[PDB]
């Protein structure tokens, strides 16, 4: 309601004695948000990730990295070729509206009885022995028919799955092993043995096979969101550089709140974020227009309430400690009785030329009192 | 004797909610008593 | 915690995972203030 | 005779520019006030000295 | 093409003191008028660095690559032109190729089938009164590639300069969590046959997310098939160690001095 | 024990979506048609 | 223990004492036949040490 | 923690299970030293 | 004995210097403890000193 109500609330009493009381800190609120990132251009490698010559076997599935690129999923979602296009940690429409820290394409070929095992939380010979998605898998699974691309009429046996293993593999493991499975109690030494099986089998992918028994080429786009300085982005967000105002800033992924200002510090061409003695960020390069910005957290301080006793008056004055009066108008804003002191801005108290004995001590030679 | 962040209306300390408050007697008032 | 930077934890995790990581920093920081104020209350008594 | 007076925003030191951290910091109760009282009692006695 | 070049004099492995060389900016973070303290894979100060010559001699062995490597060359006539890095070096796995052919610097990651003695080679002032590159005997094949960079075309001199060394080139190579980070520096010199006593910081000029195992490395030099002249160069290999370093940034924020805290 | 008021929220979902019924979850059941608060007091029951 | 022909009824669970012997636990932990192998005061990898 | 003896944790648990135990001992033993050094800093002012 | 070593006695891993004791352990005990609950004596499992 007023600073006196805040002191009564602070002291948990309906009456307050004469004094100067500390109360909840003043802090300038941000005016707007601002995203400052390095200018982007080229599109992500979708013409490699989906239209490459040959694909991986599922026993040892490929991982291809997507980096320093503009991400567009509207081609992938509008294209009628894909029979599965499913997202497990985002909505499939929102994919263009979103930015990614690092991205990969897990790329391989599988049979339609086993496409169901690519989703997280599964079991069966693909899920158990060669491709396990993690329980918290964030990203999307994408699948299409490739019998016109990858198949030969004898069956293209170039595509291999795993059939045995000492344990169900850990999420995103790739197992290259060809060492013999000891199915019976006896060991096995050398290349082959009785009642052993070789741990791999190829598929019978032919251009005459019925739908689902055809080779499906699968891409699983694993991506991770917002959590670090980012290396993939959508075709949209970076926004105009305001200065001398409090803002929620983001430079290359370095999120914060502060005033921005033009710095006279020089940064050598490889240095981006500038720090202080205490390892706090005191400056940053604008990654577009290459100039150095001072950072400062938006103006703040203790708020001290000068009061006579409640038994004397409900009139109070307020000190904004170590804060220039010019910065207070941000929030008594009437003034016409304001006063800058060495201790900070003083509001609600009338400055007097007459020197009196110190009643309520404010700081830096100033005191205050209740008088005619 | 050197000093730091004496409280007069002017980074690393300020930026983190820490504040240094001024003395009641200024170094002039201290010198008038002396 | 997975970082010392508070705003990073708030983007790397959702609420029921972040509360565990943030409370590490609230615990450690609050012990840093309680230690500084112990050192300063002992010091202030030498200056008094 | 004296030393520098200090005061701390215990909420801004622990949780500066985070509301989620400030709402978790309420789980601890009086400590930020008890710490402010200590530093205020230190600061008020530098003028006494 | 792939050949074994056996016409060498036997010299012992030489050693010299790596005085205060081999510091690099450990992160892309600006700091000034500060004495920042950091633990990372730095080159230990005043440690013995293994010294190699090209001269009569043409020292080019396969070397360990363990927690990253310091490489330096004191040079004339641009004789050190590249490196090989990887774990098998025989196309059973991928490997990293860095080369400086006379046209332009190339960097690539492939299943490279490298030669037993890999090298570049140049026709020395052959009637054309130009030094001309002609032999590129480093790999016989390159199967599964997954990274390629080539620099914008240029014309670096292969010119057979004579005198003492005039260019120092320093490099640190680290392969961390799939990120192959190169730090490097160039500075002018006027030295006979030793690594100059002085302080230097390596800037990070390129980082590649190559994602391979590197367990070793080899260096590529500019050389009818045996009996030849090697243009003279000295080079030095040091192995990095985990060691706390204190780093003095000056006003203009440039590591100006350092202390190896052991 | 006793309770001031009790409510049995009754519905049918797919077997993959029972994990989404827990507090602090995401996915189309948790996001768009049935959300529990981060401090949920009560029990989740499911049968095929 | 693991390859006896008849096991006990769970109301009358049978308890064999294992003693004066070397226990290669890597055999059991590396055996895929166990759908559960939950240790409560050791990690399973440590049992040989 | 499962033990007061630091090497008996490391003799039985792997890195991911051990750090949940070791951190308790760090938290409790660092509270023990801060208590001792606080008691000694207060004591030392009686002797000064 | 009389050298610094990384010992392990029956899985009691540690680091220390081993010397012949004159402490007389009753048969049921393999280890002796300190005020700090750390082992400060042990009976070797092959030669029972
Ligand atoms: C990104 O593009 C912009 C232009 O689109 C470049 O910024 C320009 O710089 C000149 C010189 O300061 C200004 O006159 C223009 O008004 C700027 N344009 C914009 C849109 O900002 C900028 O240089 C590019 N990025 C880099 C790294 O060079
Ligand atoms: C509060 O801030 C104002 C700036 O808004 C300061 O005023 C400046 O003071 C200097 C020195 O007299 C002048 O050269 C500037 O031109 C002034 N600018 C403006 C816009 O006022 C003022 O000095 C500050 N007060 C305190 C106590 O710090
Ligand atoms: C990276 O490559 C190195 C070298 O190929 C691997 O280390 C080898 O491992 C084998 C099998 O135990 C040994 O026979 C070799 O002597 C080792 N050589 C060296 C130089 O280490 C290393 O294991 C590989 N790392 C990974 C993670 O696969
Ligand atoms: C330096 O090496 C590069 C890479 O091996 C060479 O570039 C090739 O040049 C030929 C002939 O112009 C082209 O057909 C290839 O497509 C190029 N490949 C690449 C990836 O650039 C270059 O020719 C070499 N320069 C010299 C002088 O030998
Ligand atoms: C930081 O770099 C600047 C620029 O290179 C240095 O300032 C130069 O100093 C020389 C020698 O006094 C003058 O001839 C130049 O005119 C200055 N440059 C300009 C444009 O003013 C400065 O000395 C460097 N600072 C440090 C600490 O080395
Ligand atoms: C460890 O081995 C030793 C023998 O190598 C065993 O100790 C022997 O015990 C018999 C009966 O008292 C004595 O006759 C031998 O003289 C002892 N051995 C030696 C080397 O002198 C001992 O029993 C073994 N450990 C255990 C736990 O049984
Ligand atoms: C890239 O091609 C090479 C050569 O065709 C593949 O290496 C073969 O891998 C399979 C599976 O382990 C083996 O049967 C062959 O013996 C390997 N051949 C050679 C020459 O080494 C490699 O797997 C391919 N990689 C991808 C991702 O397709
Ligand atoms: C003897 C000799 O090496 N002559 C070379 C010739 O082979 C090369 O084709 C030509 C290119 O301009 O330069 C000269
Ligand atoms: C792949 O090729 C098809 C046509 O064969 C095309 O419709 C699709 O957009 C392409 N996708 C990518 C990622 O290049
Ligand atoms: C304060 O004023 C009220 C009347 O307004 C009176 O009841 C009370 O006794 C006074 N006490 C003092 C100490 O002034
Ligand atoms: C104090 O006196 C000065 C003249 O010495 C005058 O300029 C100033 O306005 C006076 N201040 C007040 C508050 O009366
Ligand atoms: C360096 O080599 C010299 C021999 O010239 C040797 O005496 C010295 O101990 C060596 N120091 C190190 C650190 O290897």
Swiss-Prot record, chain A:
Annotated protein name in UniProt: Spike protein S1
Phenotype upon changing residue 54 to T: In strain: Omicron/BQ.1.1, Omicron/XBB.1.5, Omicron/EG.5.1
Disulfide bond residue pairs: 44-69, 87-140, 99-233, 188-196, 246-298, 325-345, 358-367
BetaCoV S1-CTD domain segment(s): 42-235
Residues covered by region (Immunodominant HLA epitope recognized by the CD8+): 156-164
Residue ranges of the region described as Integrin-binding motif: 111-113
Outcome (variant: residue 186 to K): In strain: Delta/B.1.617.2, Omicron/BA.1, Omicron/BA.2, Omicron/BA.2.12.1, Omicron/BA.2.75, Omicron/BA.4, Omicron/BA.5, Omicron/BQ.1.1, Omicron/XBB.1.5, Omicron/EG.5.1
UniProt-reported outcome of changing residue 51 to Q: Reduced viral infectivity
Residues covered by region (Disordered): 27-43, 163-198, 227-249
Outcome following mutation: residue 54 to K: In strain: Mu/B.1.621
Impact upon substituting residue 125 to T: In strain: Gamma/P.1
Entire-sequence positions represented here: 293 to 676 of 1273
Effect on the protein of changing residue 183 to V: Increased resistance to neutralizing antibodies
Function: Attaches the virion to the cell membrane by interacting with host receptor, initiating the infection. The major receptor is host ACE2. When S2/S2' has been cleaved, binding to the receptor triggers direct fusion at the cell membrane. When S2/S2' has not been cleaved, binding to the receptor results in internalization of the virus by endocytosis using host TFRC and GRM2 and leading to fusion of the virion membrane with the host endosomal membrane. Alternatively, may use NRP1/NRP2 and integrin as entry receptors.
Effect of residue 349 to V: In strain: 19B/501Y
Quaternary structure annotation from Swiss-Prot or TrEMBL: Binds to host ACE2. RBD also interacts with the N-linked glycan on 'Asn-90' of ACE2. Cleavage of S generates a polybasic C-terminal sequence on S1 that binds to host Neuropilin-1 (NRP1) and Neuropilin-2 (NRP2) receptors. Interacts with host integrin alpha-5/beta-1 (ITGA5:ITGB1) and with ACE2 in complex with integrin alpha-5/beta-1 (ITGA5:ITGB1). May interact via cytoplasmic c-terminus with M protein. May interact (via N-terminus) with host bilirubin and biliverdin, thereby preventing antibody binding to the SARS-CoV-2 spike NTD via an allosteric mechanism.
UniProtKB/Swiss-Prot annotation, chain E:
Variant or mutagenesis effect after changing residue 6 to I: In strain: Omicron/BQ.1.1, Omicron/XBB.1.5, Omicron/EG.5.1
Mutation effect (residue 126 to E): In strain: Omicron/BA.2.75
Impact noted for substituting residue 5 to F: In strain: Beta/B.1.351, Gamma/P.1, 19B/501Y
Consequence the record notes for mutating residue 59 to A: In strain: Beta/B.1.351
Effect of residue 192 to G: In strain: Omicron/BA.2, Omicron/BA.2.12.1, Omicron/BA.2.75, Omicron/BA.4, Omicron/BA.5, Omicron/BQ.1.1
Residues carrying a glycan: 4, 48, 101, 128, 144, 213, 252
Residue ranges annotated for the BetaCoV S1-NTD domain, each copy included: 1-262
Record annotation: effect of changing residue 131 to C: In strain: Epsilon/B.1.427/B.1.429; when coupled with S13I induces resistance to NTD antibodies by changing disulfid bond in positions 15-136 to 136-152
Effect of residue 213 to Q: Increased resistance to neutralizing antibodies
Outcome recorded upon mutating residue 201 to V: In strain: 20A.EU1
Disulfide feature: 2-115, 110-145
Result after altering residue 62 to A: In strain: Omicron/XBB.1.5, Omicron/EG.5.1
Protein name (record): Spike protein S1
């Amino acid at each position: 309601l007023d600073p006196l109500s805040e002191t009564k609330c602070t002291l948990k009493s309906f009456t307050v004695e004469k004094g100067i009381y500390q109360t909840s800190n003043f802090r300038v609120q941000p005016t707007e948000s601002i995203v400052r990132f390095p200018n982007i251009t080229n599109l992500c490698p979708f013409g490699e990730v989906f239209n490459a010559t040959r694909f991986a076997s599922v026993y040892a599935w490929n991982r291809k990295r997507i980096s320093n690129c503009v991400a567009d999923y509207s081609v992938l979602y509008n294209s009628a070729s894909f029979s599965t296009f499913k997202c497990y940690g985002v909505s499939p429409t929102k994919l263009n509206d979103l930015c990614f820290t690092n991205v990969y394409a897990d790329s391989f070929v599988i049979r339609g009885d086993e496409v169901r095992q690519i989703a997280p939380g599964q079991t069966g010979k693909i899920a158990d022995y060669n491709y396990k998605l993690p329980d918290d898998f964030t990203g999307c699974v994408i699948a299409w028919n490739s019998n016109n691309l990858d198949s030969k009429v004898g069956g293209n046996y170039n595509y291999l799955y795993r059939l045995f293993r000492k344990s169900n593999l850990k999420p995103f493991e790739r197992d290259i092993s060809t060492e013999i499975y000891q199915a019976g109690s006896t060991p096995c030494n050398g290349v082959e043995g009785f009642n052993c099986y070789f741990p791999l089998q190829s598929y019978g992918f032919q251009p005459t096979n019925g739908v689902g028994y055809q080779p499906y080429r699968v891409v699983v786009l694993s991506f991770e969101l917002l959590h670090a300085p980012a290396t993939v982005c959508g075709p949209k967000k970076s926004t105009n550089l305001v200065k001398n105002k409090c803002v929620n800033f983001n430079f290359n992924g370095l999120t914060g709140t502060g005033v921005l200002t033009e710095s006279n510090k020089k940064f050598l061409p490889f240095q981006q974020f500038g720090r202080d003695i205490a390892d706090t960020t005191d400056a940053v390069r604008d990654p577009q227009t290459l100039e150095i910005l001072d950072i400062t957290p938006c103006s703040f301080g203790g708020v001290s309430v000068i009061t006579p006793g409640t038994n004397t008056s409900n009139q109070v004055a307020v000190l904004y400690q170590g804060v220039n009066c010019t910065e207070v108008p941000v929030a008594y804003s009437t003034g016409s009785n304001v006063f800058q002191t060495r201790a900070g801005c003083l509001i609600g108290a009338e400055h007097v030329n007459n020197s009196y004995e110190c009643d309520i001590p404010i700081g830096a030679g100033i005191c205050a009192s209740y008088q005619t | 004797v050197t000093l730091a962040d004496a409280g007069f209306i002017k980074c690393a300390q300020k930026f983190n909610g820490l504040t240094v408050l001024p003395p009641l007697l200024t170094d002039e008032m201290i010198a008038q008593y002396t | 915690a997975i970082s010392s930077v508070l705003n990073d934890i708030l983007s790397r995790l959702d609420k029921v995972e972040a509360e565990v990581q943030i409370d590490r920093l609230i615990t450690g920081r609050l012990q840093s203030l309680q230690t500084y104020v112990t050192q300063q209350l002992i010091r202030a008594a030498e200056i008094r | 005779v004296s030393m520098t007076k200090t005061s701390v925003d215990c909420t801004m030191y622990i949780c500066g520019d985070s509301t989620e951290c400030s709402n978790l910091l309420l789980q601890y109760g009086s400590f930020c006030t008890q710490l402010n009282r200590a530093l205020t009692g230190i600061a008020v006695e530098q003028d006494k000295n | 093409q792939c050949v074994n070049l056996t016409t060498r004099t036997q010299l012992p492995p030489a050693y010299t003191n790596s005085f205060t060389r081999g510091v690099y900016y450990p992160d892309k973070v600006f700091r000034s008028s500060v004495l920042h303290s950091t633990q990372d894979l730095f080159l230990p100060f005043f440690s013995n660095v293994t010294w190699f010559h090209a001269i009569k001699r043409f020292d080019n062995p396969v070397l360990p690559f363990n927690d990253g490597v310091y490489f330096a060359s004191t040079e004339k006539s641009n004789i050190i032109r590249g490196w090989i890095f990887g774990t098998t070096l025989d196309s059973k796995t991928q490997s990293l190729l860095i080369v400086n052919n006379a046209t332009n610097v190339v960097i690539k990651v492939c299943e490279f089938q490298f030669c037993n003695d890999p090298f570049l080679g140049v026709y020395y002032h052959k009637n054309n009164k130009s030094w001309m590159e002609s032999e590129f005997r480093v790999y016989s094949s390159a199967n599964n590639c997954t990274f390629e960079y080539v620099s914008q075309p240029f014309l670096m001199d292969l010119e057979g300069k004579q005198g003492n060394f005039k260019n120092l080139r320093e490099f640190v190579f680290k392969n961390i969590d799939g990120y192959f980070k190169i730090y490097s520096k160039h500075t002018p010199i006027n030295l006979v046959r030793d690594l100059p006593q002085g302080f230097s910081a390596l800037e990070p000029l390129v980082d590649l997310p190559i994602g391979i195992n590197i367990t070793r490395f080899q260096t590529l030099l500019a050389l009818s098939s045996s009996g030849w002249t090697a243009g003279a160069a000295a080079y030095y290999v040091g192995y990095l160690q985990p060691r706390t370093f204190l780093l003095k940034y000056n006003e203009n924020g440039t590591i100006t001095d350092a202390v190896d805290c052991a």
